[PDB]
Design a protein around this ligand. Structure first.
Ligand SMILES: CCCCCCCCCCCCCCCCCC(=O)OC[C@H](COP(=O)([O-])OCC(O)COP(=O)([O-])OC[C@@H](COC(=O)CCCCCCCCCCCCCCCCC)OC(=O)CCCCCCCCCCCCCCCCC)OC(=O)CCCCCCCCCCCCCCCCC
Ligand SMILES: CCCCCCCCCCCCCCCCCC(=O)OC[C@H](COP(=O)([O-])OCC(O)COP(=O)([O-])OC[C@@H](COC(=O)CCCCCCCCCCCCCCCCC)OC(=O)CCCCCCCCCCCCCCCCC)OC(=O)CCCCCCCCCCCCCCCCC
Ligand SMILES: CCCCCCCCCCCCCCCCCC(=O)OC[C@H](COP(=O)([O-])OCC[N+](C)(C)C)OC(=O)CCCCCCCCCCCCCCCCC
Ligand SMILES: CCCCCCCCCCCCCCCCCC(=O)OC[C@H](COP(=O)([O-])OCC[N+](C)(C)C)OC(=O)CCCCCCCCCCCCCCCCC
Ligand SMILES: CCCCCCCCCCCCCCCCCC(=O)OC[C@H](COP(=O)(O)OCCN)OC(=O)CCCCCCCCCCCCCCCCC
Ligand SMILES: CCCCCCCCCCCCCCCCCC(=O)OC[C@H](COP(=O)(O)OCCN)OC(=O)CCCCCCCCCCCCCCCCC
Ligand code: HEC
Ligand code: HEM
Ligand code: HEM
Ligand code: HEM
Ligand code: HEM
Ligand code: FES
Lengths: 164, 379, 239, 52, 56, 110, 379
């Protein structure tokens, strides 16, 4: 009985290996393909951005702003309270690097004409709808749906930040 | 020598399932819907196939393909709006079928009941994925929200949503795989419907009185064929009224805008037949709690044969049970309306109360009421 | 916040079986061509569609030939203009959406193939939007370049007043008052969103008559077959 | 096969069913002309040809 | 009664019943199409392209 | 019996009309769409090629050679082995133009 | 108290199908191909799904999407070539199955044989559409050549082509149309296969000896399940060898070129499993006669049960019919070889001889051989 069942067991373990690989084939096929793991993957920037400026980028089919939030701007956004925003978001809470604010650039609320790289209340301001923006990309005037969306940016080292 | 109808193998099955099947002679019009659903299924399989011959599933050309269907194909608009409003009619008939099951105590047919629950889940999945193909604003954003819902699952959740998306956000891969799954699923629904009928035929059917009608059965063919034909004619009347007089009555106009992923629509409500579920999700503050309540709203139909305590199978002889059943129907309507409306001050509390009342009626009110029922009848 | 709901205007194509006024469609197309086509588009609509609804075949040819469209590569691989035909969709005013957004402040003029079927309200919304411009009420200060339209969500559109009085010259001879222009363009846009409108209503009429003829008859057949059971009389004769 | 079906009474049955089979064939012909909308035949029937 | 003559003539044989149905299909289709189209053109007189093509 | 079967006959007639006008509905849907019914009315000048050269065009769905034929053929192609030559044709009836011959691409063999 | 194996409805059906079904004891290996078909079908239904999940259907993105599946999708090339060569495996099993049914006189099961012919037609059509899908040079030009046959049909024929083409030539419309049809058809094949198994089970399988084996019957489960597992292992060995080592062995390299309607490939040949019939097409100069012979080449299997004249059922004890059958197989192989080569001397005359000999063997030589055969054995 042991010999016969040993034949059976070794057959079954072989089939288990084969079936695991065959199933993983299809499952990995459904997963993210190579291209979406190449363009939608991280799109690390450099230090091509001076102080105050905001270098435009196009990552994950969405604009990216990397405005070099200077010390003064950090002071204004830290002084400005949170409840004044429609959505309370503290400057340091949403921006873990005060000198570099990382923000996906899309005017919320059907994109009614913003003003980019310049703002009454900061570095951006959106006057079409009551949508004045902050230098840290926070809604200032008018209860716009949200602030300027911030992605998951990771500063690995100097001039090396990987984002979405 | 012998009748082919009852000697030929295939004809034997057809005879025993549609011709000489002993059906109760007093089943009301509520029993017609089981036919209509099947016919609707056929129609959905049919028109959709004719939609598949001019629809190309791709981000840069899905919406243009649909608008070319409705604007340049001979009678493309008829097929397209037939399909959309036929899906809506499919869900109307499905809800009425489940209501008939709840009312007249048909869940004592446990095998058929569970197969019906599986069919229900499959149909909701099929319709959800089908709504994504037009690649409109509501399509894209509703798909985004409903797939992000799965992120609440602990541990594996984010991996699950990125696997479903086929990437990092709803995009080309999601559209293509949704089209393929949308093609495959209704045939699985058809197989499950065949299993549903097979399970049902062994126990006959449930007449409204809830008593065994073995002493009154009548042949199916002479009577219920014409009854179901009349019912299907009525359903076609309603469906064609919808298609030819107000096509987009049950539809969000914003779906006629190409999906722009940079602009969130002011409203992101799903299709009308999902709001009753969606509202439940918005009731629970917790994300995982929301998903669990969402799933449990449908899954609670499985518990019904265990929660039946009254000694009468039906409900026509149980007035207080009828009052609770209609309270439950009103609650479902309230949930649909709440899901339609935004999540603001007058609606949050109403949705919470509606969801609590729905679960409480199904689990608590009805069994205790049936206990009182039996006590009142001295048994 | 708040929102104006466009009042339900008594459109000629409102009744269950009331078609579109195709003369109004013809006038609305001209209104689009001379005013709206400067910055909007109906890329899904080609000159061919106008044949048999608002323009005759030769008129559609003449309309198409008045414009110049890009064509494919020559034998030298370049791009060359050629006069249009009844197979070229309505020309895009801006080559790419970025140019459209840049030229018109920072707003993208939506494509109007479906602008009636994509807006909550339909023709009523667009008509009220066009004939609803007014001086902003006190306490509201729009930034220079935005215009106050109550019906537009947010009450601040990036749209210059599209149609003033006597904008264009209607070939029919109808006075080009702002209200007439708006009515005609709205009817035309409704046709653009629903080209099958007239045939939809026609098939609906035939559908109504067929069901009114069939449903009584099929019901009569059902009664015929079931009348054995409805008149069935039982009896109990136990010993 | 054909040896069995070749009989006096078999041809007699064929004769009995000739009218029903022939005008079933006529039914089929008219239905085919109708559904197909065979203009070649429908141009000669008086009232219907007005459709074209 | 005429109905008796109809039954004895065109309705007794199932195949003759089908032939009657088939010819009725032709004539009913033509008559109904004429009637419905005429009713629609009457309801919306002056708006269809058929009613305005003459002036171009 | 005539009354009952007349009810049946009339409803069957109505169903026949509906079924025809729905199946033809679907079949015409599967037929050629109006976009391709923007049909092969193609155009375009012929004098591009420098005598005796084919230029391929996409005109209906399969190629179309457009060619300004060699001067030898306007006057003598009909004389090139006129005989019988299986199917006999001459440039005079093949194309009303003397030069300027056009013909679709599908071969005669398959 | 009972087995749920033989009392539960679904389990009862499965039990009577392939657990306790009485099977002949001496069933040779040639019967395994039956399951080897179904498994292939399942595989073909499986991989095709995962292909339709990354395959668009527009002529501007058909070839590009296929290359995307091959190069970018994680392990996508495995699925792609598994489909492409599993089609050839399916047809090898199909041809061997038909040969088995012919040799051992299994066509006496009239219903199953006719259903098999229907399945053969459906599978061939599905494979044709599938090969059209990737929009290569071979794809486009073979589709044009094959569909242009329907122009030979009198009267309606031309219209029919313009109907199927959805226009004036194989173009954008036809690609999506064939995609939808290639998706739907295999499920119809599955339904027909279920009906086929039903019909076969009403009588039971036929053993190689051709004699009724009701006395020596064995249960299916303990024996033929493992026999079929071994058969599936061998078929997987062959298929995996094909896919992993030489994927583009049974294909044509010109199919790796974007479809250009303005230029044709040097040769226009169909897939290999079709050449046997294509050569017959090329035999008759009369185009309508060619199409008729093309259809008859498959429809002959319908007449095959009628032509059976031998007293015995199988070919086990009919050496003369055995040589005739192997003459037929060699003739089919000859036609397959002829189909590939161009229309030149001496392939033209060899093709005519092979095509004549095929019908001569099936219609005349086999019945006359059986007639001599019975006379050689006192009956
Ligand atoms: C007059 C005042 C209004 C009376 C109807 C409203 C009402 O509450 O009636 C209650 C009253 C009491 O119900 P019941 O007679 O004890 O039981 C009804 C049967 O269970 C189920 O109904 P039934 O099978 O006895 O009779 C069919 C009935 C009901 O048909 C259905 O319920 C199926 C169709 C969908 C719902 C109705 C759509 C209209 O159809 C109609 O009443 C009208 C035709 C509807 C389309 C064809 C069916 O029912 C009716 O008057 C008719 C049925 C309900 C119609 C809604
Ligand atoms: C001796 C050298 C040549 C052997 C192959 C040719 C031959 O004469 O085979 C006779 C014979 C097969 O035919 P048979 O036994 O005279 O008649 C019964 C049937 O073949 C059915 O017999 P079975 O159910 O035992 O299946 C045996 C068959 C299995 O065939 C298959 O499984 C299908 C073919 C693809 C593998 O093996 C074959 O070799 C026949 C097909 C390939 C022939 C080359 O096979 C052998 O004597 C040995 C086969 C194993 C290879 C050594
Ligand atoms: C054979 C049945 C009739 C076929 C046919 O073409 O009927 C005419 C009608 C209308 O065609 P028609 O009458 O305009 O012209 C008939 C002759 N051909 C087709 C060569 C132009 O056919 C159809 O409507 C569809 C025919 C194909 C399906 C049968
Ligand atoms: C699918 C979704 C929608 C479903 C509902 C709408 C469509 C069907 C509605 C009508 C169904 C019932 C009537 C159908 C016709 C019928 O067979 O009635 C039963 C009746 C029952 O029989 P009968 O008793 O009425 O008539 C036959 C008996 N003699 C001859 C004495 C009158 O069937 C027939 O009459 C048999 C002949 C039918 C012929 C049909 C084809 C004719 C045209 C061929 C071309
Ligand atoms: C609105 C509801 C429909 C209009 C008619 C009113 C109605 O439904 O009455 C209840 C009806 C009567 O049926 P009966 O079995 O006679 O009830 C007991 C009588 N003592 O009984 C029923 O309708 C029973 C079936 C109810 C569930 C199916 C219909 C509602 C589905 C909602 C989802
Ligand atoms: C395979 C090659 C070997 C082969 O066939 O050997 C012959 C052998 C004999 O089998 P047996 O059943 O013993 O025959 C009676 C003997 N007195 O085996 C056979 O005869 C089995 C092979 C014939 C029957 C199975 C079908 C095979 C079809 C192959 C070609 C398929 C394509 C053409 C037909 C469609
Ligand atoms: C020279 C420019 C210009 C002209 C002329 C013009 N538009 Fe616009 N239109 C715009 C711009 C820019 C917007 C974007 C406004 C916004 O999105 O805030 C717009 C917006 C719209 C909207 C969007 C309403 C909504 O909320 O969805 C409609 C409808 C519209 N236009 C129709 C018309 C019609 C009808 C005409 C003339 C008969 C016309 N337009 C003339 C530039 C123009
Ligand atoms: C279970 C039955 C089905 C349901 C409930 C269903 C539901 C839907 C819905 C709601 C839509 C969106 C329609 C729109 O927004 O305009 C849709 C679209 C679509 N469905 Fe289905 N469907 C079903 C069966 C099928 C089948 C079997 C096919 C394939 C043969 C199919 C193919 C399509 C296609 C191609 C679209 C995109 C075109 C369109 O949006 O109308 N459907 N489906
Ligand atoms: C795919 C959709 C469905 C189809 C095609 C379908 C089909 C049918 C049909 C034809 C009947 C017999 C007619 C009748 O009794 O009304 C039936 C009965 C039944 N179905 Fe369904 N059904 C579907 C969904 C469901 C659902 C969602 C449930 C509930 C979970 C369900 C539970 C039942 C029950 C309990 C019966 C028995 C009714 C009785 O005899 O009293 N079915 N089904
Ligand atoms: C879709 C492809 C097919 C599938 C899935 C299929 C399935 C099956 C299966 C599983 C069997 C039982 C195993 C066996 O005896 O081989 C069988 C038997 C049979 N099949 Fe098929 N089959 C297919 C195609 C065909 C074709 C093309 C024919 C011929 C026209 C055919 C005729 C038969 C016959 C005659 C039998 C009985 C064999 C015997 O009793 O010895 N099948 N089929
Ligand atoms: C009856 C079984 C089937 C057969 C015999 C079959 C056959 C084929 C063939 C021969 C091709 C062309 C392969 C090539 O490019 O060289 C193909 C492609 C394709 N088939 Fe199928 N197929 C089957 C079932 C299915 C099913 C069920 C689906 C859908 C789920 C499907 C989807 C596809 C797709 C998307 C392609 C294009 C991808 C490609 O060509 O590589 N197939 N099929
Ligand atoms: S306009 Fe930019 S947020 Fe409202």
């Amino acid at each position: 009985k042991g010999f016969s069942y040993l034949i059976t067991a070794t057959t079954t373990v072989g089939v288990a290996y084969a079936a695991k690989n065959a199933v993983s084939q299809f499952v990995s096929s459904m997963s993210a393909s190579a291209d979406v793991l190449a363009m939608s993957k991280i799109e690390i920037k450099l230090s091509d951005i001076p102080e105050g400026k905001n270098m435009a980028f196009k990552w994950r089919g969405k604009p990216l702003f990397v405005r070099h939030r200077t010390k003064k701007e950090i002071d204004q956004e830290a002084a400005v309270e949170v409840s004044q925003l429609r959505d309370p978001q503290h400057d340091l809470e949403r921006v873990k690097k005060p000198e570099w604010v990382i923000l996906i650039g899309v005017c919320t609320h059907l994109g009614c004409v913003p003003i980019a790289n310049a703002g009454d209340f900061g570095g951006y301001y959106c006057p079409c709808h009551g949508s004045h923006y902050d230098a840290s990309g926070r809604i200032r005037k008018g209860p716009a749906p949200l602030n300027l969306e911030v992605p998951t940016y990771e500063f690995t080292s100097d001039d090396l930040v990987i984002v979405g | 020598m012998t009748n082919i109808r009852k000697s030929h193998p295939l004809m034997k099955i057809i005879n025993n399932a549609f011709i000489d099947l002993p059906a109760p002679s007093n089943i009301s019009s509520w029993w017609n819907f089981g036919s209509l659903l099947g016919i609707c299924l056929i129609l959905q399989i049919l028109t959709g196939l004719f939609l598949a011959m001019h629809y190309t599933s791709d981000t840069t050309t899905a919406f243009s393909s649909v608008t070319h269907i409705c604007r340049d194909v001979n009678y493309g608009w008829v097929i397209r709006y037939l399909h959309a409003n036929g899906a809506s009619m499919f869900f109307i008939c499905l809800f009425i079928h489940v209501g008939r099951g709840l009312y007249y105590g048909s869940y004592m047919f446990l095998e058929t009941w569970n197969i019906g629950v599986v069919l229900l889940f499959t149909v909701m999945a099929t319709a959800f994925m089908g709504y994504v193909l037009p690649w409109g604003q509501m399509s894209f954003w509703g798909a985004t929200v409903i797939t992000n819902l799965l992120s609440a699952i602990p541990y594996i959740g984010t991996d699950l949503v990125e696997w479903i998306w086929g990437g990092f956000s709803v995009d080309k891969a999601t559209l293509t795989r949704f089209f393929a799954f949308h093609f495959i699923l209704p045939f699985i629904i058809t197989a499950l419907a065949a299993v549903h009928l097979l399970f049902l035929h062994e126990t006959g059917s449930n007449n409204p009185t809830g008593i065994s009608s073995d002493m009154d059965k009548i042949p199916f063919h002479p009577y219920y064929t014409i009854k179901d034909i009349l019912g299907a004619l009525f359903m076609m009347l309603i469906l064609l009224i919808l298609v030819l007089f107000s096509p987009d009555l049950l539809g969000d106009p914003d779906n006629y805008t190409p999906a722009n992923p940079l602009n969130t629509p002011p409203h992101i409500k799903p299709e009308w037949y999902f709001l009753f579920a969606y509202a439940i999700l918005r009731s629970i503050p917790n994300k995982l709690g929301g998903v669990l309540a969402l799933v449990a709203s449908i899954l609670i139909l499985i518990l019904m044969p265990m929660l039946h305590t009254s000694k009468q199978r039906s409900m026509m002889f149980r007035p207080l049970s009828q009052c609770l059943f209609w309270m439950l129907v009103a609650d479902l309507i309230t949930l649909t309306w709440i899901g339609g409306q935004p999540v603001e001050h007058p609606f949050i509390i109403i949705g919470q109360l509606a969801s609590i009342l729905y679960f409480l009626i199904i689990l608590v009110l009805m069994p205790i009421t049936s206990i009182i029922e039996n006590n009142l009848l001295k048994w | 916040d708040l929102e104006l709901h466009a009042p339900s205007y008594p459109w000629s194509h409102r009744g269950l079986l009331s078609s579109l006024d195709h003369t109004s469609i013809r006038r609305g197309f001209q209104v689009y061509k001379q005013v709206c086509s400067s910055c909007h588009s109906m890329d899904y609509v080609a000159y061919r569609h106008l044949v048999g609804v608002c323009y005759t075949e030769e008129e559609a040819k003449a309309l198409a030939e008045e414009v110049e469209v890009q064509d494919g590569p020559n034998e030298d691989g370049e791009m060359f203009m050629r006069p249009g035909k009844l197979s070229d969709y309505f020309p895009k005013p801006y080559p790419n959406p970025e140019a459209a957004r840049a030229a018109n402040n920072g707003a993208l003029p939506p494509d109007l193939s479906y602008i009636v079927r994509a807006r909550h309200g339909g023709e009523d919304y667009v008509f009220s939007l066009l004939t609803g411009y007014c001086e902003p009420p006190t306490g509201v200060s729009l930034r220079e370049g935005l215009y106050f339209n109550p019906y537009f969500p947010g009450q601040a559109i990036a749209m210059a007043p599209p149609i003033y009085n006597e904008v264009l010259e209607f070939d029919d001879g109808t006075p080009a008052t702002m209200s007439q222009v708006a009515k005609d363009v709205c009817t035309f846009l409704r046709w653009a969103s629903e080209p099958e409108h007239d045939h939809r209503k026609r098939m609906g009429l035939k559908m109504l008559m067929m069901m009114g003829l069939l449903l009584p008859l099929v019901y009569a057949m059902k009664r015929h077959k079931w009348s054995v059971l409805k008149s069935r009389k039982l009896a109990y004769r136990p010993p | 096969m054909l040896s069995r079906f070749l009989g006096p009474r078999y041809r007699e049955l064929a004769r009995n069913w000739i009218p029903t089979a022939s005008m079933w064939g006529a039914v089929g012909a008219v239905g085919l002309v109708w559904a197909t909308d065979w203009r070649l035949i429908l141009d000669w029937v008086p009232y219907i040809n007005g459709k074209f | 009664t005429l109905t008796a003559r109809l039954y004895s003539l065109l309705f007794r044989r199932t195949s003759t019943f089908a032939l009657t149905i088939a010819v009725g299909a032709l004539f009913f289709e033509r008559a109904f199409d004429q009637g419905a189209d005429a009713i629609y053109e009457h309801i919306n007189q002056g708006k269809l392209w058929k009613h305005i093509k003459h002036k171009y």
